[PDB]
Paper text:
In addition, CD spectroscopy and negative stain EM imaging confirmed that fibrils remained structurally unchanged after post-treatment with anle138b, even after 96 hours of incubation at 37 °C. Interestingly, the cryo-EM structures revealed an additional weak non-proteinaceous density within the fibril’s central cavity, going from 0.31 without anle138b to 0.51 in the post-treatment fibril condition to 0.73 in the pre-treatment fibril condition. DNP NHHC spectra reveal that, under post-treatment with anle138b, the compound binds to Cγ atoms of Ile and the Cγ and Cδ atoms of Lys28. These residues are located within the loop region and exposed on the fibril surface, indicating that anle138b interacts with the fibril at the surface under these conditions. Therefore, binding to the central cavity cannot be definitively confirmed or excluded under the post-treatment condition. Isothermal titration calorimetry (ITC) thermodynamically characterized the surface binding of anle138b to L1 Aβ₄₀ fibrils, revealing exothermic binding with a dissociation constant (Kd) of 0.64 μM and a stoichiometry of ~0.72 molecules per monomer. Furthermore, Gly25, located within the central cavity, shows a loss of hydration, consistent with displacement of water from the cavity upon anle138b binding. This interpretation is supported by the loss of the Asp23–Lys28 salt bridge on the loop surface, suggesting that anle138b binding correlates with increased loop flexibility.
Therapeutic antibodies can slow down the disease, but are associated with potential severe side effects, motivating the development of small molecules to halt disease progression. This study investigates the interaction between the clinical drug candidate small molecule anle138b and lipidic Aβ₄₀ fibrils of type 1 (L1). The L1 Aβ₄₀ fibrils consist of two protofilaments that share an identical fold and are symmetrically twisted together, forming a double-protofilament helical structure. Each monomer is composed of three β-strands, with a long transition region (Ala21-Gly33, hereafter referred to as the loop region) located between the 2nd β-strand (β2: Lys16-Phe20) and the 3rd β-strand (β3: Leu34-Val36). A cavity is formed at the interface between the protofilaments arranged with 2 fold symmetry, with the loop regions from each monomer contributing to cavity formation.
Numbering used by the authors:
A (entry chain I), B (entry chain G), C (entry chain E), D (entry chain C), E (entry chain A), F (entry chain H), ...: 1 to 40
Write the structure that this text describes.
């Protein structure tokens, strides 16, 4: 007369989570505050 | 008459989590505060 | 009449977690505060 | 009539955690406070 | 009538943790406070 | 019979140039690549 | 019979130039690549 | 019969140049590659 | 009959140049590659 | 009949140049490659 109970508040089987962040808040290109040339 | 109970608040089986962060807050390119040339 | 109870608040089986951080807060490129040339 | 109880608040089996940090807060490129040339 | 109890607050089996830090806070590239040339 | 010539290719008198750069390419606030919480 | 010539290709008198750059390419506020919470 | 010639390719009188760079490419705030909490 | 010639390719009188760089490429705030807490 | 010639390729009178670099490439704040706590 087995109970054979399984009682898990959370059960997870076979879960793959990938979190990928690429290039957040980053500079791959020029940031210049001022360019000044040719000033007489 | 076995209970055969399994009672786990959390059960995790076979979980892969990948957290990848690439290039957060980083410079791969030029940041210049000022460029000044040719000033007479 | 075995209980055969398993009672674990957390059970983890076969979990792989990869945390990868690459290039956080880093410079691979030029940062210059000032460039000044040609000033007369 | 065995209890066969397993009672572990935390059970971990077969867990691999990799934490990788590469290049946090680091310079592989030029940081110059000032470049000044050609000043007369 | 064996209890066969296992009662461990923490049980860990087969856990590999790798913590890798490479190049935190480090310079592999030039940091110059000032470059000044050609000043007359 | 004085020539009284003044012959200057460039003449500058009384010139003030201010170049100000503030906060180019800079972080005064949080940059986070990932925030992850509450994952079961 | 004075020439009293003044012959300057450029003459500048009393010139003030202000170049101000504030907050170019900069973060004063949060940039987050991902926020993830409550994932079961 | 004086020439009284002044012949200067560049003449500068009374010139003040201020170049100010503040906070180029710099962090005054948090950069985090990953924040991960509460992972079961 | 004096020539009274002045012949200077560059003449500079009374010139003040200030180059100021503050906080180029620098951290006054936290950079963290990973923060991980609460992982079961 | 004096020539009274002055012939200087460069003449500089009364020039003050200040180059100031503060905090180039420097850490006044925490850089941490990893923080890991609470891992079971």
């Amino acid at each position: 007369d087995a109970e054979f109970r399984h009682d898990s508040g959370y059960e997870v089987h076979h879960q793959k989570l990938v979190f990928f962040a690429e290039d957040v808040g980053s500079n791959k290109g020029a940031i210049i505050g001022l360019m000044v040339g040719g000033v007489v």
